[model samples]
Target chain A: PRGSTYKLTLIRHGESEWNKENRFTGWTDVSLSEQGVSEAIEAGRMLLEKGFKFDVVYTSVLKRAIMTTWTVLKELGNINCPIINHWRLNERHYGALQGLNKSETASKFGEDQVKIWRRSFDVPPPVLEKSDPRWPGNELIYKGICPSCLPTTECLKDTVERVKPYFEDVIAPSIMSGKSVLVSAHGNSLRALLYLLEGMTPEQILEVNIPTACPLVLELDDYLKVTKKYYLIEE
Target chain B: TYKLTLIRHGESEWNKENRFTGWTDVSLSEQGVSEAIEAGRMLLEKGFKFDVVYTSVLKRAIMTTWTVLKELGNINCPIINHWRLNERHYGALQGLNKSETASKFGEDQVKIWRRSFDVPPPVLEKSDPRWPGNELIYKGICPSCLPTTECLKDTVERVKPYFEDVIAPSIMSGKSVLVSAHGNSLRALLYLLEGMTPEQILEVNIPTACPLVLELDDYLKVTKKYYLI
Candidate 1:
């Protein structure tokens, strides 16, 4: 009876250039494709029809997610809503595997092996060497990261480790305080959170795939226990 | 020459509070929303159709431009955000109450600071965390470009290219253009359009959300100017 009950809706960003190209995007910061744009617009329409009103919205710092949130807010006639951009909710950093075509990587490493590496709950891809051109550790803001904390690639378990604390400290408190919350995030990041919420084993998470622009709605009881969970996607 | 329409943003929350809200990132008040809707309806009634839309990166102007375009049923039109179109950076005086500033600095000095063309107010320090150009979204810009100088010498250099490269060509190509901008930036533009000297530009008063329409001849000479409020 102490915790407040509320609805939490999570949406993964629509397709990006990397998504279309079958690449492992990670933190590459690509914009949405034309089909992704259409998906986002339709997502906005779905939310608008449901008459969903949110007090605050959270999004990853990446532009694709930011733009998707913008489009949805614009369509909902709530452009003035306060937004918080947190890097914690960013897509699982693909590390050295970022920007590589997934199909080709799968071809090179055997499809079954690649599937295990990609879909494994605990196995991350090869780490990017510090000398790698894509390593952002040279940037002033990222310089504070410990050499070991710097992710070369991320598995779902690694993603969950990074995501769980934020949910516990930042998101859970907001929901418990009775604020309507919406999170726009990446596939692996959302999947990691979902694994925790749904009490899924590490192996079960491999079967979960969150489609683009579809909303996952969760109804919680007074104790913050999830009473129901379902997907909201207009055909 | 072609028709060029210029409008300042509507009443923001700070405007109703009588605050000096230069680049403070305030939202438009209800009145501001109504003003934008009314302005859009008026433009629609006048049969105005723009191929593209432009606004400052600041939210008040951005929101106003979006609202007007949405009301005009051109939601998909391309939007170009240029820092040059931003309001005159108020420096350290931003977010201060107008009456409070008047009480502290005296009415005459505040008036001169507000209206004077070249006399910019105090400059914001580079170390101030509230400075927007410091944000990640403002990549590809330097701290010197962040409206920190009293004279705005740097702003003038950065702002002119937008007119020369973007606006002038579009106008020359026979396109109807709408520029929703701010006080000093619009003044800078009017200086360019009318070839007004630094002294002459100070006389121009751009009322908020009022459309200033300029008609020009084939020779690019200004034939007439009118305001739609």
Candidate 2:
């Protein structure tokens, strides 16, 4: 609400139990680790210190993201804002790679193969079937929405492509009108959004490391393109 | 889809500790979380679904709603978070261990504070730091509407308008609604739904983490009501 720029804050969820376990956890619905919970509280304090109050919140259906958004608003001492819970904002589906230990994965498919799988941008890991336990379709969370649109596995490009529609239709309109917005999401999903916001290349976006529970502020012009950006911590 | 389900939030940390939580905003204990999930699982097994959800702004009830909907395949439903559904404000009794308070204040007095229909506990002052006046959840709400302490009668007074104005309309529209709230909140609503006198309503017990489904006719009178597991 200042200087012809709308405020957008993206916060990667704090560490999940799976995150601490060194496992891939896409759509797994793991709650935050104890440390992750502390990170979230710290993030909320920082936002209050910086004098930012949110008008709306956007989050994936995952509890990790949901709880983070809840914690921040609780710390901000304001939980009255409208929150939009959308699957499109969910973390990228990890496919067969989900729930597997990273070290185990590297051992099974060499470190180089695992590295490429992690950052290849377009090369998705082995796809998990709808019948697979890891499938979002298997959960009640996705049963109400377009089931066919749910992913079995997705590359970063696919993640970005899917979120594009929602970013344009839902998020853009409110933000350009200067409704202060905050998003709590996974590392990859926020990467997809930052991919668009920071105008980073696919390769460069993959290289972007979003810290857990830290808030990133982007001041945007009327076009919703970035006018100014900074992390809420000393760089 | 003529259903009104009352889901008391799972066992809160305060509940497990046997403390007077009131509007203290306690989180669900691990046991509480599991109980909440199990409640959802029971409802899903019984073929229950909802189109809308209602809960207090308190996190315990809110999380219980999400967890239950996650199991019921109704996670995407529109949720109405109203303060009227919050447990009666406990005033100075908040955070005090229940048995300890009973021992200190005498069981009869604690019972009066907890059970009496009209008698309220000690009122909270804005000068007292625990007062929710500065809380963000009450940000846009009228200051007078926020309660410091309330008895069951005061709870009914605060909750009836919300139920009549918002919840009744949504239910009248034929959308199945689920309410996740605290024991006192549910009790206040149930008093109206079941049409019990003040003395008689005290005998009704609504267990925690159980889905108590109410079948209402178009006018919102209870046709059938029972706990799902």
Candidate 3:
């Protein structure tokens, strides 16, 4: 039986300065690089050209995602669109690995160990000590969040556990009620979401790579079963 | 003096065309964008940092807020958009050319409608496309509260509660705030904060995209105010 189809759009934030530096950014607050800004602007142009309108937007509190959402909203000529930011949508915590160059990390940790840390679904990178300033609780914006809930290190599975419930509790009902939703978040966070939405196996999720600033449209049935999914700009 | 800055949105497309733009969603003119950018740069140069920002639901003001925040490199600051900060509604005068309206209604009558503290412009019919109720963005607001037209007095009545309850306390709590709104809305706030009489407020006009900085006491009384050009 045919039921109502709801449209949900997801976008990964554009390249950050850390991305350009080839560092593991994780929850680090970094500004978009010049190229990243250009990509976000172009993403906005493309969405506007497709006549996409969003009733509400969701983004991580991090600036890279927030700026991407703002740029897209500005291009849509609908900056008045309501946006909600939550810590649940943050990137998978790179933990002690954050701010370290990927190449150098391989040199330091050995290539196979670095590969396991990056590619494992459940094996978390080294966690930050509570006293470390890199801890999420140390960030002012996360002050309101329960310190226990703030992640210092996360595997893809940990990210999925946090993000999945938010979709179930907050974002899913809004989509089911006929609201067009846009989610601007980070790569691994989005991957966590996609892993749940697509029902991918642990190994399959590792193969999927989310490109920066690309809009992915997912059509879901009334019960939230995915009917179709595709990127707005396909190569 | 606590740090609180108020900015009037820059010129809109309708503003340059000399049309009444109250409550009508319009894009900023090129000059308006530049003005907002300049205002942001001035704030940056002065080492101003905001913990929070507030603006109307209207696009012109929201865009200005975005531009200013972008310039400050603080786009992640929490922004609260509220309908209470909207420009004074022009009612039936919306979309009418100011000069043409003056020609039709006589310059004196037009001046009274434009400048009078309590006198509202002609009311708009509920069925009109320009009615606030017709816009999806305004659907969240109660139907009974929607206005067909409004006077400066009406605007102050609407803005006062929000300022007293929300904005005033934020400043007292040590949160540096940036308010991006239209001329009349800012004027209404200024009228309340500075305790200006109706006639005095009417004579004072806020410049577009110019940040009006204010230092306030713990009781929310204004100790000093000046424009940060």
Best-fitting candidate, scored by DockQ: 3
iRMSD, all candidates: 9.1, 3.8, 1.1
- Cα error of candidate 2 at position B182, Å: 6.9
Model 1 stretches with alpha carbons more than 4 Å out? A1-4, A106-112, A138-149, B1-229
Candidate 2 lDDT for residue A4:
45
Give the higher-DockQ candidate: 1 or 2: 2
| Candidate 2 structure quality by residue, lDDT tens digits, A201-229 | 88788778888889998888777777788
1 against 2, candidate with superior TM-score: 2
Per-residue lDDT for B17-63 in model 3, tens only? 99989999889999999999999999999998888898999999998
RMSD of 2: 6.3
Q: Give the CAPRI rating of model 1.
A: incorrect
lDDT of prediction 1:
0.75
Scoring model 1 with DockQ, what do you get?
A: 0.05
Candidate 1 lDDT over A1-235, as tens digits, reads: 2343678989998998878888888876677888887888888888989888666677875667767777887676655454666667888887767877856686556666666667678877777787887675653324434666556677778889988888889888888876778898889888877887777888788898888898889877665556777887645
The regions of model 3 sitting more than 4 angstroms off are A129-138, A198-200, B1-3, B172-174
Candidate 2 deviant stretches above 4 angstroms: A1-4, A107-113, B1-3, B7-52, B57-79, B83-177, B181-212, B217-220, B226-229
DockQ of 2: 0.18
Better of 2 and 3 by TM-score: 3
lDDT of candidate 3 at residue A148, scale 0 to 100: 78
For model 3, residues A18-93, the per-residue Cα lDDT tens digits are 9889999889988889888889998899899999988889899899999889888888876889888888898888
